[PDB]
Amino acid sequence: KKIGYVWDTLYSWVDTGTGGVFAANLSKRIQPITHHMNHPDTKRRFNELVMTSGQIDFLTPIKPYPATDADILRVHDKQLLDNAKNVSNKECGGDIGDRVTHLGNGGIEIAYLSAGGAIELTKKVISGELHTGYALVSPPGHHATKKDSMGFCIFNNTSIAAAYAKDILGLKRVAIVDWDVHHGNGTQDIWWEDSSVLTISIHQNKCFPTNSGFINERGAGNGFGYNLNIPLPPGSGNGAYIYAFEKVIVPALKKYEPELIIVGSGFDASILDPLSRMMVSSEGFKKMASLILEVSNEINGGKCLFVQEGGYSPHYLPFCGLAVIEALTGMHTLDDPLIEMGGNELLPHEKKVVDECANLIADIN
Amino acid sequence: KIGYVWDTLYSWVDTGTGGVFAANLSKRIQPITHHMNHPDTKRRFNELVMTSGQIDFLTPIKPYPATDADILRVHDKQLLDNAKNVSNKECGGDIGDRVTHLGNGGIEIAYLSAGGAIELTKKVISGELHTGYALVSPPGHHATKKDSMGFCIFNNTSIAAAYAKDILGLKRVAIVDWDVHHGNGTQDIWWEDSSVLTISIHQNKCFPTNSGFINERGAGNGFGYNLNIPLPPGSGNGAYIYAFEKVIVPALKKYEPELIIVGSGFDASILDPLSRMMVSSEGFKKMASLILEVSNEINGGKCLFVQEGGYSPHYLPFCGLAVIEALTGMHTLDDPLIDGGNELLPHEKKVVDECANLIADIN
Amino acid sequence: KIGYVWDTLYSWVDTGTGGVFAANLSKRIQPITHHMNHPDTKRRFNELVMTSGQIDFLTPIKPYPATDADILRVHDKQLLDNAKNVSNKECGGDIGDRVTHLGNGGIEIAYLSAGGAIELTKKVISGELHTGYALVSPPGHHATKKDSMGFCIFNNTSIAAAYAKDILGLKRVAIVDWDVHHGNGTQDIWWEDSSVLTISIHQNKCFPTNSGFINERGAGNGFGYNLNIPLPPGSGNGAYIYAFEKVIVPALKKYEPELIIVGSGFDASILDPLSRMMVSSEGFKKMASLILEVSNEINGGKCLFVQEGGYSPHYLPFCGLAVIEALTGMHTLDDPLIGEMGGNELLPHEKKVVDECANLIADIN
Amino acid sequence: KIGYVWDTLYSWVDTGTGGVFAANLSKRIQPITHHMNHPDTKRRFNELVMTSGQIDFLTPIKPYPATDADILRVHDKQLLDNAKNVSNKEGDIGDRVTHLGNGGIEIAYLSAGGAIELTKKVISGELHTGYALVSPPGHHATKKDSMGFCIFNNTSIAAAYAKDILGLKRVAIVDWDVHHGNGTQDIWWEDSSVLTISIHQNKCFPTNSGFINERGAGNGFGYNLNIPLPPGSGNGAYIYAFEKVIVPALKKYEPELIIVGSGFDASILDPLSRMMVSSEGFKKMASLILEVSNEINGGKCLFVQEGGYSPHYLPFCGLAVIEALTGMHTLDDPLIGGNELLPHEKKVVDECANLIADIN
Ligand SMILES: [Cl-]
Ligand SMILES: [Cl-]
Ligand SMILES: [Cl-]
Ligand SMILES: [Cl-]
Ligand SMILES: [K+]
Ligand SMILES: [K+]
Ligand SMILES: [K+]
Ligand SMILES: [K+]
Ligand SMILES: [K+]
Ligand SMILES: [K+]
Ligand SMILES: [K+]
Ligand SMILES: [K+]
Ligand SMILES: [Zn+2]
Ligand SMILES: [Zn+2]
Ligand SMILES: [Zn+2]
Ligand SMILES: [Zn+2]
């Protein structure tokens, strides 16, 4: 099996000097800090461990190419794009919309290459050039709506790829399965009225955004019943996550019969991530990818692919990400340095949410 | 009259080696520049105290080093000898647990850390101060009688309690530790002793993974005088406040300690990487206010707060400031992220209530 | 009685977004976390003052903001207003020289910096203190009447000079700048004024590249009362001390100022990236000592030191500490680099420059 | 066809402990997050080769570990044994400033093997030239001792390989790192089969070696040439040194391989020198080397990374050398001094040109 791997040095050049929840603000006494949350070193360490662990030998490198305006404009409005162009034009950079999201001088080039990364991987998976793959792209995508960039996301990478698989490669049912610890409100908005894209987001209840991602947000029109949120409570771990994957997401995908599954693969649900209270360990992420690999092999011949979302622990993210790479290559080259107390047992209030979400599968056809 | 202990040397801890993710080429753990226990976190706290204007309400206390005699009231010579040996190596070295590291001459800072808790204790018992905050480093609550571990060389609060007992003649002392990790060192040091009541509220099963459960109540004459509240992952201000009101405050009232020492960690904060708790800065203020309140009711406001863990350089300074503000009565700066876990949940309540039964055995 | 001016806000300057190497994707200047003017350099100076015991021989002096009036004695209203413009912006901005940057609310640090030089000046002039050191930040000596530049928003030493004259009644002040770069701002501010003798010893043609020559000597009432000493790249203790003993001290003796103000930068040190000078800590100590001595000989010891530039986080603390030991007399601690790396001999082409400058003394009256 | 050697592991060197400014509470040297030899400096260089598009003109070359035998062609067993011992621990290796993390010998092996891989492909004709962006550096290690961030003398290891395995009889090592290549000088001191040239800042490091009178011994008298430039020297002194000493020494000796020890610590922003070389000075130095390489041995020269300590400016100095080899200039120096040739500088180069007479 050829397993694609999308990486480019530019992904590690996102400018995070300004911006963020804790931007320097002398008036409010927020002291300048050296390492901001979305500092590029977290995903760079992931890439660098892929190299030095030998997993790269089982992988086929895939060079990304810039997405075009037309690729972006299939899901995003011209207002959003021209805004990102004009902010990226300024010297020193600029806020983009929600204050937290920063676009540096010329930063749009990285957003273009990031989105094209997801498209290159898609093109190679649907053609048969590759059985699956991992696109370690940055900046992330899943918070960008039809109208707005937010949450570090300029463009909705996975949605741009799903619209590419549909509008150019002729697919008719796609599923975007997003396990980033925050709700994928961007993806949910883009496909809100559309049943040709099943969108699923499992996430921490009320984390980001604080007012979206609830069970009863289900789509509308032709889209009703083709958006599914699993909002787990803080503290959930491998127990809750695997239970959710087995009772809800895998039966949901079996029902919908997608011809391509795109995983929004974030790792901010990790046990050490500063922007969650979830307890997923790297082996949990391994079992998560395998379940998705497996059901994909059952139905659409392994046509699935993983695209990086968030993740903020420079220490532990590389091993979470490497664990998912191993589930694609089936070679174990290296142990988790934390190879196990907390989060592995399924708690009844964690179960009460997943049982509720399992009833939603009946409305998928 | 509110003391504040700080010294520049507390921010000179060398954190280049060690950590759970200490560089290891064979295991492919890449060197990183910012380890978890980097000095920037507690340095940003002390600088916010300065630039928020709180310092105008605070009486600075210069710390002096603890003696060997002060460390030996609670630690075995083996522990102290070990730290002198490692502190002597030219490059420093691992203290024993392959996580804690002590730089060359780093024992100087460990003495100063403990002495800072002793200077605050001296001045509060004597009446020179009403209460205070000692922002010391390295922290203490994981050091047992025999073993340094978890970034702790010396058990600062225990050294302070022992000093208050054996030198200042106190008979009854309580240590209240709200660091998110079980204070296993304090538990071990006073296991057999009813004259220091030890209470740890912490995340169930975080660190160390083999301690902190309800059934660890002490031994011998000390049975009933160690109390653990292990909250579930995800607990926030509602479980913590509820725990302080149904367990910790009734317990102190019953025990009637001549002095309360709080081990003030902030790694239970909503943003800390080493916890899954959701306490906010407002949450920490109330917890502090409740200890003052109970301290003013039963022993004459004789309480003080001694820094333990905390690893979020963005949000810890505001959690520390909120505790300082609860000591001064003066609000001077808003928490910038306060725009959650404020609702108490059945499974958090069930732990807290099971713990309230244990108050009966405190006499 | 030795004053020491420090404040935590001096280490809170926002420097993650600007400078010669500001992030520019188009030019492929990759984002970096430590810029040249990072506050850790001067913070480590202050912390070494604390941890060495020198603080026990010093009188801490608390700074208060300079007013607009203090700033306007030497700067055009456009400069002051342009500082408020940039400072109020969310996330700051370029002050208008593509190198200098003002954080959000950062004008408050600018005010407190000039305030720190005023407060030491007041306390020294009034006899309350004999001398002192103001470890202020940002530096000042590049700011002209019209323009902020080179990390300097306000000319701190010139604002303290103008305060001593127009409020405390002094008629003769001398500003001696040993920052490795030319004090173009001090020279410009007092170009036409003889009541402020301005001396700058610098690296010939570093920053600005178009000033600092011997033939710049003032105009009007000010002719002969500006003195530039442009030493060659490579100069160290041998040339710096010869320049002090043959030009700067004789010029001060001839001038008989009521107060001597030292712009004390440490960027001429052997390890500083932004110069090619080889001064060591013992050189900076002797330089401070010579000023102290001529000042105790003529104007009753009325001199003080205001921090300017310096960019070696490893070595600046010991250079700055060495200057304090000249003030306090107390040797607490040894320079951990004592040396044979060069510069202690006075080379011929270095004397050629100093000797020329010594002729300019004849026109100081 | 131009080779480029890089491996992710070269940026995994552990620079947390050690250094001339290693933390020391009794000397009150405060711990610092960024030491002088931090991997970021050479990682940025590599990442600029990627993002500038120079990589599209380059042939990537995977490095392979030098073997113990490779090391022992030029180093004593004690040096090698000392490194395995220090590497097995969870330490300092020789001169206090050189530090080797646990298992760090793996990277030193990979560093020397990188300079061997480039050398093989350049001799074989598979490549015309190339650049080996290896770490840790090498030119300070002698037969007996590692020192100055240098575990193994990479360029000397590659020169021994080119001779014993590949059959070359004359090799030249040109070292333009700002510090004296005392290691290389020591390894080939009695040997005329390796012309060793070092241009460095007079008395910088080590403070006690690098002088003109140090010309070799025995068979090797006349085949070691030191050019010790005065502090403050720049593009002027350096280009005059190359046109008037280094190139003519190389034309006279006629080596079959030129190995450049390529350091950028002579650059205008480096904290560890007082030299004023700019990115165009390095490009010009590289170009003179290629020019004489094509005139006298068919373009058989290669560049091996030594020192350099400015994360901001080093990447553009290294890009400038890559641009020289590729002939494709796709990016400007954002900073673009000592372009003038000073008499005390010329006095040094002039005395050195006299030395070319004893090269045969
Ligand atoms: Cl942030
Ligand atoms: Cl760590
Ligand atoms: Cl910069
Ligand atoms: Cl260093
Ligand atoms: K999600
Ligand atoms: K949908
Ligand atoms: K007890
Ligand atoms: K605790
Ligand atoms: K003047
Ligand atoms: K100057
Ligand atoms: K050299
Ligand atoms: K030789
Ligand atoms: Zn996220
Ligand atoms: Zn802790
Ligand atoms: Zn300067
Ligand atoms: Zn070097």
Tab-separated table of N, CA and C in Angstrom, chain C residues 6 19 46 87 89 108 169 198 241 246 257 263 288 291 331 334 336 352 354:
chain	number	residue	atom	x	y	z
C	6	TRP	N	15.076	50.999	38.342
C	6	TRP	CA	14.580	49.863	37.589
C	6	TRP	C	13.071	49.837	37.735
C	19	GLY	N	11.617	45.160	13.367
C	19	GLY	CA	13.069	45.148	13.376
C	19	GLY	C	13.647	44.920	11.988
C	46	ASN	N	19.492	43.449	35.189
C	46	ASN	CA	18.862	43.768	36.469
C	46	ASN	C	18.917	42.588	37.436
C	87	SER	N	0.672	53.737	19.350
C	87	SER	CA	0.524	52.996	20.598
C	87	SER	C	-0.919	52.553	20.823
C	89	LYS	N	-3.142	51.615	18.709
C	89	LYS	CA	-3.621	50.589	17.788
C	89	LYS	C	-3.617	49.218	18.443
C	108	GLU	N	3.422	53.904	27.207
C	108	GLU	CA	3.580	53.968	28.651
C	108	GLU	C	4.986	53.559	29.065
C	169	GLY	N	17.628	74.884	36.778
C	169	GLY	CA	18.441	76.078	36.599
C	169	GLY	C	19.867	75.882	36.107
C	198	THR	N	27.822	67.748	23.512
C	198	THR	CA	27.414	66.386	23.158
C	198	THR	C	28.595	65.637	22.556
C	241	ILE	N	39.982	53.443	25.953
C	241	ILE	CA	40.518	54.153	27.114
C	241	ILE	C	41.400	55.325	26.676
C	246	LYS	N	42.469	61.031	26.404
C	246	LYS	CA	43.059	62.087	25.600
C	246	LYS	C	42.040	63.070	25.031
C	257	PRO	N	31.106	71.303	33.002
C	257	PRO	CA	29.647	71.192	33.082
C	257	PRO	C	29.158	71.062	34.510
C	263	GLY	N	25.207	58.297	28.393
C	263	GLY	CA	24.465	57.278	27.674
C	263	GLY	C	25.278	55.996	27.650
C	288	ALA	N	33.689	54.045	32.984
C	288	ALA	CA	32.852	54.634	34.017
C	288	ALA	C	33.704	55.325	35.074
C	291	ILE	N	34.956	58.849	33.998
C	291	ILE	CA	33.911	59.859	34.095
C	291	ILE	C	33.697	60.250	35.552
C	331	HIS	N	33.522	44.890	44.485
C	331	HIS	CA	33.722	43.784	43.552
C	331	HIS	C	33.082	42.534	44.140
C	334	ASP	N	33.396	37.912	39.515
C	334	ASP	CA	34.364	37.981	38.429
C	334	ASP	C	33.719	37.766	37.064
C	336	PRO	N	33.270	36.112	33.852
C	336	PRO	CA	33.602	34.735	33.474
C	336	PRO	C	34.038	34.622	32.026
C	352	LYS	N	45.471	57.347	15.276
C	352	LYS	CA	45.326	58.399	14.275
C	352	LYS	C	43.966	59.079	14.396
C	354	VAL	N	41.877	59.131	17.197
C	354	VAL	CA	41.713	59.832	18.466
C	354	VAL	C	42.496	61.143	18.455
